[PDB]
């Protein structure tokens with residue numbers, strides 16, 4: 096019968112910091128992590144900036160010998176996972192290792208690695224492909240490598256649901272525990288899609304902000320002058336735990352995961368419907384899953400990608416789900432500061448939603464100078480808003496019309 | 508408690524055929540789908556063969572224009588999904604579309620599209636990259652496109668657990684239905700990594716059979732002369748359905764999905780442990796999930812990849828789980844005929860396990876001329892074996908030591 100699930104550990108690499116507290120400090124201070132990209136030449140690209148992870152040292156986590164075999168998205172995923180597990184205080188034993196699993200996902204996975212091996216194949220031939228090309232690039236190897244290093248013998252898998260990956264990964268890991276398949280799950284996602292194919296590929300679709308001359312002002316969710324999303328890199332990981340197992344070991348509990356919804360738009364490969372019908376269905380599934388009156392919702396960490404269509408669809412979804420209470424809750428997009436971490440989006444934003452509950456503060460939407468037509472809710476423009484938050488909701492929407500919603504509340 | 512889940516439709520592209528009955532007819536005849544790969548200069552590669560899909564006509568499913576936008580792995584996934592839905596006789600309506608979802612996954616995803624867009628990028632720069640590059644290459648687009656084409660608004664997601672993808676997709680889809688999150692799911696996996704990067708990538712790890720002189724003999728699970736797996740392409744899809752929903756509309760039910768087990772080896776990135784301790788825990792987990800005693804298992808569709816360490820671990824795992832019943836059950840590897848479809852392996856092998864129940868026949872392990880040390884189980888060498896089959900297991904054990912087991916039972 097269905098068990099309760101709490102958050103006892105979190106971990107992160109973001110464009111604002113190499114852990115949670117440094118990332119969170121940046122969020123509350125309204126700081127942008129967006130900057131011209133330095134790790135490659137982008138003069139031929141329409142977009143030349145993004146949220147890079149700055150000064151990441153993999154040797155805080157892994158031997159240079161193992162690190163060399165792994166795409167950055169895996170290094171980022173393991174870093175966030177290791178932080179989350181350490182932060183949880185949990186010790187892995189023969190008694191519990193079969194009951195601890197991992198679900199760390201990615202939207203695109205090892206694109207840099209596949210690109211670099213593609214260049215070796217084309218310039219030199221197949222004999223120059225790394226022997227580590229497959230284990231070092233494919234999306235499930237965050238879950239795999241993490242299980243090997245820590246001895247996790249529980250459910251071991253990975254989701255790939257584009258920009259919804261992190262939310263789905265956390266949601267379904269919670270279901271694992273809820274239904275007794277595991278007592279502990281490390282869940283979230285990682286992304287590093289800032290290579291030629293990534294920036295080029297989103298470039299070709301005309302999906303990215305081209306504001307190359309003012310990168311910190313590019314990501315401006317619901318601003319009338321927004322021109323697409325800002326591509327960003329990193330990882331979020333949470334330790335999810337059965338409540339009684341957490342109480343049994345005297346775990347510090349950040350919050351309770353009370354609600355998970357999924358829906359498909361069944362509308363368009365890449366465009367959300369203007370009315371946010373699928374987002375609405377998703378949030379309603381989540382609230383019913385949590386047993387909540389929608390008026391209990393205090394804070395929404397929006398998907399809020401800074402696209403023309405996605406942003407307005409979210410307002411429509413929120414107004415349709417919350418009616419008049421849509422004017423009382425606070426909604427913000429931390430993507431205003433971090434940019435869009437794609438598959439890791441839902442993972443870092445679930446962490447911000449939990450830290451919103453711990454600290455009783457709504458993070459800001461920076462750059463919201465001129466709210467667009469119909470965008471007339473509390474969008475926490477410019478500056479963090481201290482306020483009562485009992486219930487926090489985190490939304491993700493992806494290519495394929497794939498929707499995810501997480502519902503967190505304060506735990507006593 | 509928990510709802511019962513049945514199989515009401517199946518769909519497939521394999522190296523043996525362009526649908527289930529043609530594929531199955533090959534399986535029961537012991538036919539190989541393995542041949543040298545065409546329209547591709549493999550001169551500089553140590554492997555020049557695999558299981559290609561032969562004669563696939565995407566325009567039976569899609570317009571030329573929509574097919575141009577999608578990697579072959581996505582096309583293959585949609586073919587199987589379309590077959591399975593049609594095979595089910597399901598009618599999607601406004602009254603049920605929110606209760607119908609998709610979980611079609613892949614191990615490796617759009618290598619062929621990545622290869623071709625790399626060519627453009629390296630030759631001509633980023634502005635030649637296709638607008639559809641990203642949505643046409645990411646693993647969740649089978650679920651995405653299928654949900655858009657059929658108006659499916661239920662849970663929409665995708666697994667990527669390497670060679671365990673298909674087994675995990677079907678298992679977690681069954682959970683969605685059992686715990687009332689959906690009445691219907693389309694689940695399985697697809698793969699097309701017979702490109703330079705797949706053959707090169709796996710070739711660089713020396714994972715592949717290099718028996719170029721005799722492609723049909725390359726795949727020889729548990730034979731003392733096996734020298735690694737054979738890379739194969741295709742897709743499996745199953746329509747999973749809650750039992751009462753199936754009975755009400757008068758569906759033809761192939762079999763019941765009674766059990767799903769997962770585990771992690773926590774051993775090595777690509778090598779199983781010698782004793783198959785992980786595959787043993789996963790099978791025990793699947794049998795416990797099904798409330799069945801190991802003694803009740805009649806037929807196992809092995810992982811049976813034709814790798815030295817993989818085959819021997821599966822024998823040890825079975826002997827350990829099954830004790831004095833281990834010789835009584837029949838266990839075959841259809842990979843002896845199909846080769847290894849990676850993330851689609853588990854989907855097509857689930858279908859073969861369901862058809863072994865319908866037809867009371869264990870498919871052969873072809874090329875098993877000289878069983879290896881300790882491979883003294885009933886491995887159904889050379890030819891099909893008619894027998895009693897009430898309960899059938901399908902095992903998948905992939906990179907990162909991620910294990911999956913499905914338990915199917917005859918339905919009357």
Ligand SMILES: c1n[nH]c(-c2nccs2)n1
Pocket residue numbers: 567568589590593
């Ligand atoms: C070729 N074989 N099966 C099919 C389709 N079934 C349903 C939609 S298209 N085309």
